[PDB]
Amino acid sequence: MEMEKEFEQIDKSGSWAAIYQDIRHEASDFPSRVAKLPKNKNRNRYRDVSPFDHSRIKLHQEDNDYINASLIKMEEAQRSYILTQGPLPNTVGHFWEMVWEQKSRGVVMLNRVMEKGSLKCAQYWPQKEEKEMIFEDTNLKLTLISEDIKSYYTVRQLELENLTTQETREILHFHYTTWPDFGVPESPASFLNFLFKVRESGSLSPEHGPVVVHCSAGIGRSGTFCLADTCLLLMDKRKDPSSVDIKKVLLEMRKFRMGLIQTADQLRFSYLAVIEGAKFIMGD
Ligand SMILES: O=C(O)c1cccc(-c2ccco2)c1
């Protein structure tokens, strides 16, 4: 069923809350035993948001390999994403270790450091060129190279140095700065513009490790970004673009990380973004 007609049918019937609960009911449940070990309590931002054991990213160290991060591998679309929480004061070094070890080119940040008067994630990147950051626990140096501030987002060029080998890499930081404190954006135009800027950078392409995507918990806004990207790519690839079923793509993604798309409004916004984005994919 053409999702644009499914959309008008759910809207006219006001059944978004009902569709959403149906997804919550059918979603996978896998063990998260490593996340719940007592040694890892200060590595988790939220007690109810944990990576599954089968899909968790492992840090390359014998001490403690744990980070709150999941590999979402989309087989038909040929795209992979790492979804993670906003870094905590004691996990900023783990965060950059993961970027280094997974060979990522891009970090996508969908939250502000402060929202609703509370801290949603650590200040994990340098704000001035001449004030670099050293992560002594993981032996990394991070330097701000350049910053481009636009109305709806900021792009930063960062240099990450492995102090052990003196290898360096360029990381691109894509920071969506205008998601509202409550609810979802009224139009998806600025979110799609942002998604197309990440794609244009090479950050989502198979010559690099998976893109790292986060918000505060790494399930809600983060879920919306990867769901929209994957659905538009499948509409490009398939003989019949009207066969793309957004609810079925979301359940596939929930096999790899719990809780993706946190509200019925985020579900409705994901539909709007895919429907408006398809008017480019189909030749405009
Ligand atoms: O990434 C870096 O370490 C670096 C160092 C010097 C110059 C530039 C640069 C990028 C685009 C034009 O010049 C980048």
Curated annotation (Swiss-Prot):
Which GO CC annotations does the UniProt entry carry? cytoplasm; cytoplasmic side of endoplasmic reticulum membrane; cytosol; early endosome; endoplasmic reticulum; endosome lumen; glutamatergic synapse; mitochondrial crista
Using the record's annotations, give every residue carrying the modification Cysteine sulfinic acid (-SO2H).
215
Q: Which residues of the full protein are shown?
A: 1 to 284 of 435
* PTM section of the record: Oxidized on Cys-215; the Cys-SOH formed in response to redox signaling reacts with the alpha-amido of the following residue to form a sulfenamide cross-link, triggering a conformational change that inhibits substrate binding and activity. The active site can be restored by reduction. Ser-50 is the major site of phosphorylation as compared to Ser-242 and Ser-243. Activated by phosphorylation at Ser-50.
Q: In which tissues is it expressed?
A: Expressed in keratinocytes (at protein level).
Q: Where in the cell is it found?
A: Endoplasmic reticulum membrane
Give me the disulphide-bonded residues.
none
Q: Which residues does the record list as Phosphoserine (modified residue)?
A: 50, 242-243
Using the record's annotations, give every residue carrying the modification Phosphotyrosine. 20, 66
- Cross-link type N,N-(cysteine-1,S-diyl)serine (Cys-Ser), residue numbers: 215-216
| Residues annotated with N-acetylmethionine modification | 1
Broad enzyme group: hydrolase
**Can you say what this protein is called?**
Tyrosine-protein phosphatase non-receptor type 1
Q: Keywords of this protein's UniProt record, alphabetized?
A: Acetylation, Endoplasmic reticulum, Hydrolase, Membrane, Oxidation, Phosphoprotein, Protein phosphatase, S-nitrosylation
| Binding residue positions for substrate | 181, 215-221, 262
User: EC number(s) for this protein?
Assistant: 3.1.3.48
Q: Name one GO biological process term.
A: negative regulation of phosphatidylinositol 3-kinase/protein kinase B signal transduction
Q: What residues form the catalytic site here?
A: 215
Provide the catalytic activity annotation.
O-phospho-L-tyrosyl-[protein] + H2O = L-tyrosyl-[protein] + phosphate
Tell me where in this chain the PTM S-nitrosocysteine is found. Answer: 215
Question: What family is reported?
Answer: Belongs to the protein-tyrosine phosphatase family. Non-receptor class 1 subfamily.
Q: Which one of the record's GO molecular function terms can you name?
A: protein kinase binding
Organism whose genome encodes this protein: Homo sapiens (Human)
Specify the Tyrosine-protein phosphatase domain's residue ranges. Answer: 3-277
Q: Main role? A: Tyrosine-protein phosphatase which acts as a regulator of endoplasmic reticulum unfolded protein response. Mediates dephosphorylation of EIF2AK3/PERK; inactivating the protein kinase activity of EIF2AK3/PERK. May play an important role in CKII- and p60c-src-induced signal transduction cascades. May regulate the EFNA5-EPHA3 signaling pathway which modulates cell reorganization and cell-cell repulsion. May also regulate the hepatocyte growth factor receptor signaling pathway through dephosphorylation of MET.
On assembly, the entry states: Interacts with EPHA3 (phosphorylated); dephosphorylates EPHA3 and may regulate its trafficking and function. Interacts with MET. Interacts with NCK1.
